[model samples]
Target: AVEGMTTNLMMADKEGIIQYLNPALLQLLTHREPELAQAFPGFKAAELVGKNIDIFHKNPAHQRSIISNPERLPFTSMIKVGSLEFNLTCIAMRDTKGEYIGPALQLVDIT
Candidate 1:
C-alpha cells in the first residue's frame, strides 16, 4: 500500500537506521542528488537505505530524543538540509505490546 502511495515515506529503527524509503522519496532524492552531494559528499539515492538518519539532521542528538520516544510524537516540523527545505511528520511505530519500535516519517520537499 505504501509503495503505491504518492506521499514520501520513510521508516527507521529505534536506533535510527533506515529501514525503508518509498519511491516518492527516492525519486525526490534522485532528482536532487547532484545538489545534495555538494553538502553531503557521496550522496546517492540508491545508497540511502541502511544509512543512519543522522545524515539528514544538523542536531542528531535532539532529533534522536524525539524519534526515540513515542510520547513525543506524532510530530511535525520543518527542517533544512544543506540548501534544501522540507517538512516532516513523524509517527511512532510500536510493537504489539505497545512498546516503541521506531518511527515512520512522511517527508515533503518545499524547496
Candidate 2:
C-alpha cells in the first residue's frame, strides 16, 4: 500500500474527481481537515470522493498545466496541499482503452 511506501499516491477520474487515495494521502487530508479523522471513524478518503483535485492547490491556475497534458513527463516541484509541502509529481493517466482518464499524483513530503 502507498501508505507504507515512501511516496504518497492518489487517483482521480477523467473529470478530475477523486476516486482513490492511499493511506498516506488520506493522512494528508487529516492534516488539512483534522476533524476528518473523527468524522470518518478511522479516516477514510470517502469524504474526499467525488471532490475535484482543486482541493490540493492554492493557486487554481497552477493546476491547469499538468491537467491539460494528456501525457506525463514527471514534473517535480514544491507543492502545497493544505499545510503540507511536497516534492510532487503529477502524471496524466490513460485507461485500459487508451483514453486519457485523469491525473495520478504522487508525492514525497518536504514538510
Off by over 4 Å in 1: 1-5
User: lDDT tens string, model 2, 5-30?
Assistant: 47578877766778888887777665
For 1-111, candidate 1 gives per-residue lDDT tens digits of: 334436889999999999998988988888888779988988888888899989777889988999877887999999776787778899998889988889999977777
Lowest lDDT sum, 10 consecutive residues, model 2, at 35-44
Q: For candidate 1, report its TM-score.
A: 0.86
**Alpha-carbon deviation at 59 in model 2, angstroms:** 3.5
Which predicted model would earn the best lDDT? 1
Full-model lDDT for every candidate: 0.85, 0.67
| Superposed model 2: Cα runs more than 4 Å off | 1-5, 31-46
In model 2, pairs of residues that clash are: none
- Global local distance difference test of model 2: 0.67
